[PDB]
Amino acid sequence: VSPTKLNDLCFTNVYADSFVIRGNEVSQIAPGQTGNIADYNYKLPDDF
């Protein structure tokens, strides 16, 4: 979704998940990633 177009759209399912991680771990939060955060802690779907 475009960052400036989330206002006018209607949304079916919304999920709000909240946690804290380290500075080198933020780039791992992405669809299809490797690493123990992405493999054993929190895995995003491939079509995210």
């Binding site: 206002n7 006018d8 759209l9 209607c10 949304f11």
Partner: protein, 48 residues
Amino acid sequence: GPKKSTNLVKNKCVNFNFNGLTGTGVLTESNKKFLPFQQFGRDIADTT
């Protein structure tokens, strides 16, 4: 989102936005016996 609702216009060609479903056409009333869980309507070739 926070958008203003508009009163019902009927039997005229009009752009319509029902819950983020953007389209263009004419609105009329029909005797389609929708079941209470049924929201949208479709036919041949999956057209709204």
